[PDB]
Amino acid sequence: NPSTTQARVVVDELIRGGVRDVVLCPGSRNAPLAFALQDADRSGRIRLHVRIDERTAGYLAIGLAIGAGAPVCVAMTSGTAVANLGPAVVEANYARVPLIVLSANRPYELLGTGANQTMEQLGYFGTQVRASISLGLAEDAPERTSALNATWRSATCRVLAAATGARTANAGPVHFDIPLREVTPPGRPAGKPWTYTPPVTFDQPLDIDLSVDTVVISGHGAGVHPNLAALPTVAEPTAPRSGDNPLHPLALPLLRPQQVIMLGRPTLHRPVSVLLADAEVPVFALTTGPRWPDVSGNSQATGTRAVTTGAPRPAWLDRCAAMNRHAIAAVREQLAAHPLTTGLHVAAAVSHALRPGDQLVLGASNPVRDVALAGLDTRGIRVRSNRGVAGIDGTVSTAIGAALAYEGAHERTPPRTIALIGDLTFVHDSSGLLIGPTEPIPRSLTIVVSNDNGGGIFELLEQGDPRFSDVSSRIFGTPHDVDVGALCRAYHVESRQIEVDELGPTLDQPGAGMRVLEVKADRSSLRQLHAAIKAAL
Amino acid sequence: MNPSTTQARVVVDELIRGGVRDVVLCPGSRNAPLAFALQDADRSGRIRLHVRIDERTAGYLAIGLAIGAGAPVCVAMTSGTAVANLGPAVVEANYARVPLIVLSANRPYELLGTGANQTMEQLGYFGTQVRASISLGLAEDAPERTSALNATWRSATCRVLAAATGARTANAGPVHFDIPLREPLVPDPEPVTPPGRPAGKPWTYTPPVTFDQPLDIDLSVDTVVISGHGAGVHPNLAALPTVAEPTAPRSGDNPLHPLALPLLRPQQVIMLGRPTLHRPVSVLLADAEVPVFALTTGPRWPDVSGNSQATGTRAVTTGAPRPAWLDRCAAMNRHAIAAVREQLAAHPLTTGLHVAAAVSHALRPGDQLVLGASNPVRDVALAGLDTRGIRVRSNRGVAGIDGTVSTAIGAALAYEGAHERTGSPDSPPRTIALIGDLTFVHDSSGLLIGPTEPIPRSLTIVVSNDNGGSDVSSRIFGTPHDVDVGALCRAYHVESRQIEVDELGPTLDQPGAGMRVLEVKADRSSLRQLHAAIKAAL
Amino acid sequence: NPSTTQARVVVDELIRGGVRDVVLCPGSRNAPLAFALQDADRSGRIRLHVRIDERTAGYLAIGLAIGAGAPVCVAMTSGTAVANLGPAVVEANYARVPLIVLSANRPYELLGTGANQTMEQLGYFGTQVRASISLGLAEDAPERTSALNATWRSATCRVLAAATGARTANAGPVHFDIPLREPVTPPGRPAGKPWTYTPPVTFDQPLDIDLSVDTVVISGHGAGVHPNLAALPTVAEPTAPRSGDNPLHPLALPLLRPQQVIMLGRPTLHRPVSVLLADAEVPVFALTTGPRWPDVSGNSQATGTRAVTTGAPRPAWLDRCAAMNRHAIAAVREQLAAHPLTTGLHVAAAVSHALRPGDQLVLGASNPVRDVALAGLDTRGIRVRSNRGVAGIDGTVSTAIGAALAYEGAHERTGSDSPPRTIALIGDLTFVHDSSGLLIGPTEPIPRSLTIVVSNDNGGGIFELLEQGDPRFSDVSSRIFGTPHDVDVGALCRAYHVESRQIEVDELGPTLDQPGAGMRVLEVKADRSSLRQLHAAIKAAL
């Protein structure tokens, strides 16, 4: 049967292409490549992960992909799959995550006359994916077997290349269809991919004078630049550090830089935004990919590399270091001077509890920002966050998937994965905790939940102004009164409600493979704390 | 100064700063702000404006203007089906990787679904065929925001240019640039445009990316090089036997005739660019036993072979070809050239292959050759035209019949323009087009150039008229279309002369009489026999 | 062969559904239902039309549909097909034309890895069509013959229903795919009936309207007929069917102060109409068929399908409207006589006077469709066509040809008598845009009574009447709005071997009264340098 042959060949080439994990959900139809994936999983060639929640399944795949940087497949099996995978596919697009979406259309059946149970199309595939490839029906012609083998493996390599950005340097989601109707031909020798793609470089050098008072701002997907290591650098948590000279975010308004070098895609901090939009400050964007970030339209130039002349003035260098120490002081003072535990307190505790080789998974809203404010030094540490579109959905499964993949990478040679998320974020993707006994479960994952019973970040915005006090709580705060401990145990997951002093010591000593550490926090004092911090500036 | 006028003048200015030297314009009222700004820029000599009536062939004129010198070219039109008519050109631009900017004016988006006249779903119309779909905002009546709006407008314009030229992707192609506009649409009575960067710089400077991907290839293995549309130049592969499509740039001098290829047994193939032309090439790439290596200038690589072992932009070569292998391919090449020449002589009746052979011999270094993407390209390849020193153009993206005349005219204009830019006193270089009669008739309205619009200084269109040349649709080929070419040429006031194939060479060296059509009668009845004779002569 | 059997079932059902014309173009691959269509053409159950130009083919199909109101098929067979059919599909959407676009996907072939020769997809199918239906591959299963027959005819009927608006009252283009693997008929219902019959449908949305309030009726494209509104002053676009016999000239409208407006269908003409409809002080009632209502300003008070009326127009209001109507008519007539140079407005007046009941009139966009309204054409007994969906000047030649063919085909089937005339009035730019539509092979159907009047003022005359036609732009507007071309129309028609004559406006009437070749082009030279002053003089004479 050609379909069975086709499936094994595709699965084989996917494995050759670096795919180690595949996510499935039970549906009305059986999965594309269903049986070939089973045989591959049973023989340990790949690892399968099954979920009931289709939405959290997609975010599990994102986690599995960003964990060690490998391409990951997720298989559509139902008439709700497309809708549910939407959020994950969007994040995969904007965060540039190698996500292969597997589908199986039925060419011998009618389309467009009613609802169908394996495919219900929306409009996002045409705007989010790097490629849409359909394998075409497998036909019975044994004398064309080697031609078909070459066709299937070539197309599969196209899917992988598009997903990983092998030739485009633009990773993202790919839609891969293997149409269904109702001894496996060998690939290349020694497990090589059918179509090999050697390393690729995109080179766009920009001339930059470093004697001009320069600050470096790095965001999601930023590259490593040794020739900029000396410059003062405001680096987002997910940005890899190039050097030794960090500049705290809060010290930025205290300085008047004369030019800016922007690495990757910055999404955090208003003073960062204000600075990039400053029309008198030349901005140079150094990023990988087809497009560049520039909300204001102020960027003077874009590229991938800097050709530097000169060096930063010692006066400028010293002024930056002074404001840096000043900002760091102000943050630590006002935290100590504050009795009530907030999300910012928790962030610092988690931050100082971290050790080299750890993986840190940060949720959206305050957690990702608070860690940057707590002055985390990210070197020797691998930080993940869904900054593509910054949703508070699917962060639990992301952390789980990231853990499994990061643990898998070292079993192949286990390191800790610590997640810091808000309470809303936890409630959103609570169903990601539901993992059957037959499914893979991380051995070294801890989820820290800063629970201030609502959306703390809204206290820091104009809707957090005291004149909105009576109306703000319901529509922005949104308190929920959820018993977290009861929720975790409902899913049979180890959980402790502890204070911030114990957070360090607790994280230092291991436990069950999956555990949730909950820390009670307050948000009523957040706007004042931040005001006090800038007052110390 | 009203918002529509301001916005249009900024966009035009930034486009010029981005290297746009030619703009194609089609009449309308909704695109008045663009038309005014463009006419003004043409008046001051910053760009050259080309006004056309038919949006479809206007798009192919823009394609010609782009491939004639390698610059980004805009085409501007009004809202509605005017935009939809750019569809064919956009598809061709996509697959041929042509920097074509579709600059469409639109009603404000809030008028969508309201029943407003001449309003349709424009944004996203081209789907996945374009490198990007970018919309400007509706221009605000807000003088305070003038500075911020200037930045965003110029930024978006730069995003358009980058995507079109492939400045960051190394994959040039068409971009849809939709601009919603509302009244007033004409300039105010005026007894100042917000400036761009100093010294005429682009608002956001993005230099042409260097896309590099080296690949190891052992040349001691018996190798043939097959180069198609968009192929790069490889000095370290110059000695290898090379089957090159007319639009491919030659890397060296060891030509292998297409007909010779199926009579040889290469142990590996180096594929350059995107080869679509030859069936024996298709046959060889089709059999999955022979290893194929794909070398491309951009991230795209062809699917024509299921046995592509690897991709790259350039080869890192070890070894050297067997001298016996070189001798064999060289011998078979001469054999094929002989067979074609001999069989051509042994035929009394003038066919399209004869006409193509005549045009080939008449070519000289520095010429531009524009080929109709069906028979002319194949025939020229059969005649074994040596393409060194000449620039060959053809719409090999999807090889459609549309816009061949406009593309030829556009290519001539752009080529002649690049000539003037360097202050050479010489006459403008020659552009010679070879197209079939069905192709000519179908895009005959591409000849139409308004009395006030730029005319090519040295363009000659050679029309090989064999008079029209399984399925029920084919019945229209059952009788010769009988269309008077001379009448068509008079209708659009263009010089035409019907001549014989022996007269072709001498006539082509006559001084450039601006733009002219040379009709050469040919026969297609004796063609299946001629090809069969050639095939048996091998 | 299962595929061949499938194709015959589908074609048969299509013919049962009212399809009489199918448009094809030669392509890389065989057409969908190629042989079944060929069999039907030979037997005379259906008529095939073949063109080389895929764009003009799309508009040919539109013409074949609006000519007699029948669903029409067009076959996508090439890699440029989707791109070229775009314009016609968009027009079909907005003008609500039953256009069925046939395609044949190939499931056994790779997809999305490179160039496609069956279909290179753009993004408009998602937005323009009423339905996208794929038949699914035909299986070899003699035990499943009657079931598959039922399935195929059911789906084909769905395709036809969506295109004709049988149940939605929303006609439009439909994407019908019949997949293919490369490389007699099971019967339909007895008595030639469609497999799934859709009996007459009504959408009823009555609105209460007091007609004693000073009321004007403005009727545009797709307007319905309303007997209870027949007495009212009515400003009817040429393509709108007239409910009554109390016409109100467009130029008379701003000389009146209607307290109330009933808007029928979709108006796209005249700036006074747009200004009145936007007037917040004037209640607008939109009576139209379909899902959407036209309302650019958003001022409209209510929308429905028909009016339940009380009261009646005041006799003084009728007298007032009739008086301004006579001033407008007189102004146009007097100023046309007082201006020596022939304009498009002159030509429109000549064509209008030359029409007889039973004629079909096809109007190109720009000035012609407006000039005819200004000339005061009485459209009663006349069938008037114009692509007002998106008002393109593209494809109007093939539209007229297709319209003539369908209109003549319907008259032949009555067995009556020479075919009723189709007369097209288009501008020169419009003619140049779609001149290739004249090229029709002797193998293909050709009109027997089509006459294309080309009012040639060597450019876009309508732009003289807009803001950019103001004298202060006289130095710059000739290139970018005038767009003169100096085309020899006679030579162009001669090239395609189409009968052609250049005549003066005085001769137009008599020349039109005399029949000629089945297809002929009458060219009238016109001036547009005097257009702005002519319209200004007409206004000053009101």
Ligand SMILES: C=C(O[C@H]1C=C[C@H]([C@@](O)(CCC(=O)O)c2sc(CCOP(=O)(O)OP(=O)(O)O)c(C)[n+]2Cc2c[nH]c(C)nc2=N)[C@@H](C(=O)O)[C@@H]1O)C(=O)O
């Ligand atoms: C940061 C700013 O603005 C952002 C402030 C908050 C929201 C935000 O986007 C923030 C996302 C981010 O950039 O990290 C958040 S935080 C936020 C509260 C998170 O609360 P938490 O308890 O998880 O954490 P916290 O209490 O803040 O520590 C919410 C609801 N939302 C909206 C939201 C809605 N739905 C989904 C699926 N995803 C979402 N991100 C954004 C928004 O809704 O427009 C907003 O743009 C700013 O102006 O500086």
Ligand SMILES: C=C(O[C@H]1C=C[C@H]([C@@](O)(CCC(=O)O)c2sc(CCOP(=O)(O)OP(=O)(O)O)c(C)[n+]2Cc2c[nH]c(C)nc2=N)[C@@H](C(=O)O)[C@@H]1O)C(=O)O
């Ligand atoms: C009538 C007004 O403005 C219209 C003025 C003209 C154009 C128009 O749309 C008119 C269509 C109509 O409503 O009937 C025309 S007339 C027109 C000139 C026609 O010249 P002609 O010689 O055929 O006729 P004429 O000389 O006017 O008798 C042009 C070019 N165009 C633009 C155009 C461009 N491309 C395509 C495919 N279709 C098009 N409609 C419209 C536009 O471009 O925005 C515009 O909306 C008004 O403001 O009242």
Ligand SMILES: [Mg+2]
């Ligand atoms: Mg919270």
Ligand SMILES: [Mg+2]
């Ligand atoms: Mg020919």
Ligand SMILES: [Mg+2]
């Ligand atoms: Mg005109």
